[PDB]
Amino acid sequence: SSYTVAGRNVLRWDLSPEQIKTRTEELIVQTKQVYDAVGMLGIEEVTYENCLQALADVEVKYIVERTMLDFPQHVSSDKEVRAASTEADKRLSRFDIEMSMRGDIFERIVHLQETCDLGKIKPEARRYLEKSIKMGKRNGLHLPEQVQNEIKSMKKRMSELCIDFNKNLNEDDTFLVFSKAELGALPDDFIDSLEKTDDDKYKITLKYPHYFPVMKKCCIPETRRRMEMAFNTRCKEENTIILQQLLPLRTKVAKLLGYSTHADFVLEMNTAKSTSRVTAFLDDLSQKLKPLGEAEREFILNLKKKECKDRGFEYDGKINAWDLYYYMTQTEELKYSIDQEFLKEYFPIEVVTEGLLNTYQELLGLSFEQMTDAHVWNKSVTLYTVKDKATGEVLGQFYLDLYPREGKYNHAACFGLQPGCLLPDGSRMMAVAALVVNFSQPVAGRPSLLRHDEVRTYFHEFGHVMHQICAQTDFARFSGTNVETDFVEVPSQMLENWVWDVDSLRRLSKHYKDGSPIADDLLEKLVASRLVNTGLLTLRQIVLSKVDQSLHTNTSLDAASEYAKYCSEILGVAATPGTNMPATFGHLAGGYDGQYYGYLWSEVFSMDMFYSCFKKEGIMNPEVGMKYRNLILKPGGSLDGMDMLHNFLKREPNQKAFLMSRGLH
C-alpha cells in the first residue's frame, strides 16, 4: 500500500559471498529470459504490452536485485563480501552492455514508436521510447554490425577499467609515520585518536579524516609536504596505465559513433548541450575570478612570509600545493574570527541530525520516523521512514551511515537503492536511499562534533536523499536522481544554503557541554565567512573541470602535465613535481567523465532558485518548499532539467544570483 511500510523494502543485507555469486547468476538468467522473449517477437507483433511494458517490468526488477549485489562492496565490513560484490558488479556491468547492444530489441522499440498513436500514451512512455532509441543510437545499433561488435568490445573493456580504477583507490591503505613534534599545532583530540607505533610515533593515513586536518592545521611544512606528495601519488603507476587505456578507448568509440571527441559525446546528454558552452562557461567564470585569486594568493604569501619569519623557517617565496589549505584556514581565522575546532563544539551530531530532519520536514512537508530493530548492513546504520506530512503516503525510507570504518566508501555519497516507480501490478514501489559519509567519531568522552563543513556536507547529501525519495515516475530508468549529470547536483547544492542562514544555524547548534547556543556575534561572522577563500576554491574547481574536458577532448595529452598546466595558468599554485592528481581523480571513472563542470553548472541553477524564490519569500516557506518538491524533485528524470527549472522559476534561469552569491556583482 502507498500508506504502509511493511514488506515494501525488499532489500536484504545478510548475503554471504556464495549467495551474492549465486544471485548474480540467477539474475542474469532470468533477466535474459525477458530480453530473449521480446527479441523472439515478430516485428509486426510488438505492442505496448508485450514489448514496452515487458521491458519496463524487467528493468525495475533488475535494478532492485542489482542493488543487493553491487552495493555491499561500498559498506560491508566483511572484505570477502565486498570482493564478491565487486565481482558481481563486473559481471552485471558486462551483462548491462550485452543487453543494451541487442539489435533485435532496438528494431522493435523503433517499430513501436513508428506505429503507435504517440498522442494517446502517457508522456513518460513517449519519453521512454525516444530515450531508449537515443540510447540505442549512442550504442551504434543503427550502424553496421561490424562497428557494433567493435563498440561492444571496447565498452566491456572500459567498464572493467573504470571499476578497477575506483577499486584501486578504495582499497588503498597508504599511511605515514610522524612523531608528536612533527604534528605540531594539531589538537589533542586528533592526536589521541591516532594509532601509535613502537617508536612512540603516530600513524596518519591518506583518508580524508586524516589528510585534511593535517593539511589545514599542521604547522610543520615538511609534514604537510610529505602528506601532499603521498596523497597525490596514490595508485600513481597502476591508475596511470588505466587512464592511458581508458581515455583513448573513449575517443575511439566516440569517433566510431560519429562524434569528434568523447566530451562532445557526453555533453549531448546534459543541459549544457555542447562543449563550446562548457568552455565559454568555465573561461568566463575564470576571468571574473582572476582578481580574487590574485588578492587571495597575495594575502596567503604575505601570511607565509610572516610565519616563516616569526618561526625561523625557510621561505621559498611561493605558495606550494601543501601550503594552500593551511593558509586558507589562517585566512578564515584572521578575517572572520572562525576557529573551526571551537565551532564544532556547537554541532554535536545528534543535535545536527535533529535540526536537519526538522528543517526538511517543515520545508518539504514531510515527516521522518526512525525505525527500531532495523535490518541494516552495519550496527551503526540507522533507518528512517519518510511520509508525506499531509496525506500519510509512505514515500520512502533512507539509511544513515555516518561514521568511518575499514572497507567503507571513504568519501561522501547518496545511493539510490529502490526506485520510486510503478511495479508490474500497477502499485508504486517505495523509494529507498542511503546517505554514506565519514563524519568524525566520538572521541575524548564527547559526542561526535561536526565542523561546519561537515554540516554542509550533511545537508548536501541529504538533498540527494530527498531527491531520491520524493521522485515518483512511471519508469525505473527515470526514477530518483536519474536526471542529467550536470543537473543532479542542483538539489544537493540547493540545500547547502540552509547552513549559511543565521536562524537555521541556531536550530542546528547547541553546545555539547552546557547546552548553550552560539553567540550572535560568532553566528553573524560564520554566515559572513561564506565567501572566504572563494577565489582560489572556485579556481581549483575550474582547474578540475578544465582538466576533465581536456583529457576527453585531446586524448594524446599526458594527464599529469595537463593538470600541471591548468594549475599554474588558472589556480596560480603549481602542481607538485612527481605527483599525478588525475590518477586519483575518481570522478573520471565514476560517471563524471567529461562532465565534472556540472558541479559549477548546477550551482548556477540552485543559486538562482534559492535567491529568486526562497530568500524572497522566506527560506522556511512551506508552499515555496512544496513547489520545489513537486516541480524539481518529484519528476525525477521524467522531465528535462531545463523544463523543471522553467516550471519552477516561470522563466529561463540565469547567472545573476550565482554571480551575486560569489561577490562578482
Binding site: 568519501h411 561522501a412 555519497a413 547518496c414 556536507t457 547529501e461 543532479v488
Partner: peptide
Amino acid sequence: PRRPYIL
C-alpha cells in the same frame, strides 16, 4: 553513485 566535489 552521486558524490560531491573533489576538494
